[PDB]
Design a protein around this ligand. Structure first.
Ligand SMILES: CNC(=O)c1cc2nc(-c3ccccc3)[nH]c2cc1NC(=O)c1cccc(C)n1
Ligand SMILES: [Mg+2]
Ligand SMILES: [Zn+2]
Length: 313
């Protein structure tokens, strides 16, 4: 119990900021995650032995793909940590437990291919899960790891608390299906504006947690420009591999997945920022004002992409 994780001074300070980059030292990422659980949740939330074993099994079940990898999992969990720390009083003890774990697990066993590619390939997962295919898989993988001997980090919760946290985790992971984000944000936009948004209404909380999951999942667009730009390479490495596999099925991929249209990436980023990112962080900032730095960083990166198009970089 008297055992804390302590980070070096620069990390200890910068980890509190939304735009923190977890760095290139893979062996520090578990400790960074444990540090965040302890400060966000308490040193009591989890048996450290069970947590460490859970973390290492989750890492093993992430694949060596360019973007949807173990670094992405820890990066998404850090954005959730920053949201939770800037909104201390808004979230229950169970929600803080669930959401950091949900973020770590949200892309478990990702192959670097979209739901669309799985359906067109006719992958077995697409037969098992007709919508949110990869996301239902990610939740299935999470439950599987929780049920390994010595890996049940929730074992000290009551029966009712255990069912509530697994339900928080299921909804949180499903919500990372971007197809579901558009309608979820529209509903939240209507509720905030007509003044009907009520955080004591569970269906309303579910929607707000959904948006937080989207915000954390997209947080590559909220880093300093050098991080955002280098992450974009990893994102397009997966998209273009998927586009290659579409061409192998005899289907022309959408331009975003066609490496022959590299030139139009900057304009592709504008659409993404305007159609998804900016709307996402705007609504989150309306509901949770202290998440404003995410919207500010997103707008800064939109302006950097505009400068790339105008030939200035
Ligand atoms: C819903 N629209 C998009 O997801 C999206 C559409 C795009 N269209 C282009 C494009 C258009 C013409 C020529 C070349 C490229 N690039 C795109 C990139 C996109 N997404 C991300 O960059 C991104 C970032 C982070 C996380 C996720 C899930 N996605
Ligand atoms: Mg995902
Ligand atoms: Zn993700």
């Amino acid at each position: 119990g008297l055992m804390q994780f302590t980070l070096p001074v620069r990390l200890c300070k910068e980890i509190e900021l939304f735009h923190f980059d977890i760095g290139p030292f893979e062996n520090m990422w578990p400790g960074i995650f444990v540090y965040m659980v302890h400060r966000s949740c308490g040193t009591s939330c989890f048996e450290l032995e069970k947590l460490c074993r859970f973390i290492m099994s989750v890492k093993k079940n992430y694949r060596r793909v360019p973007y949807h990898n173990w670094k992405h999992a820890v990066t998404v969990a850090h954005c959730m940590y920053a949201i939770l720390q800037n909104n201390h009083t808004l979230f229950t003890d169970l929600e803080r437990k669930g959401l950091l774990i949900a973020c770590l697990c949200h892309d478990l066993d990702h192959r670097g291919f979209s739901n669309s590619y799985l359906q067109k390939f006719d992958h077995p997962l697409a037969a098992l899960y007709s919508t949110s295919t990869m996301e239902q898989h990610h939740f299935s993988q999470t439950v599987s790891i929780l049920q390994l001997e010595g890996h049940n980090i929730f074992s000290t919760l009551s029966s009712s608390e255990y069912e509530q946290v697994l339900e928080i985790i299921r909804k949180a992971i499903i919500a990372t299906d971007l197809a579901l984000y558009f309608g979820n944000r529209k509903q939240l936009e209507e509720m905030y504006q007509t003044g009907s948004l009520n955080l004591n209404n569970q269906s309303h909380r579910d929607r707000v947690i959904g948006l937080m999951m989207t915000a954390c999942d997209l947080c590559s667009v909220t880093k300093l420009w050098p991080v955002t730009k280098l992450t974009a390479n990893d994102i397009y490495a997966e998209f273009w591999a998927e586009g290659d596999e579409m061409k192998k099925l005899g289907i022309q991929p959408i331009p975003m997945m066609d490496r022959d249209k590299k030139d139009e990436v900057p304009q592709g980023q504008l659409g993404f920022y305007n159609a998804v990112a900016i709307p996402c962080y705007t609504t989150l900032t309306q509901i949770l004002p202290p998440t404003e730095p995410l919207l500010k960083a997103c707008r800064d990166n939109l302006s950097q992409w505009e400068k790339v198009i105008r030939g200035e970089e």
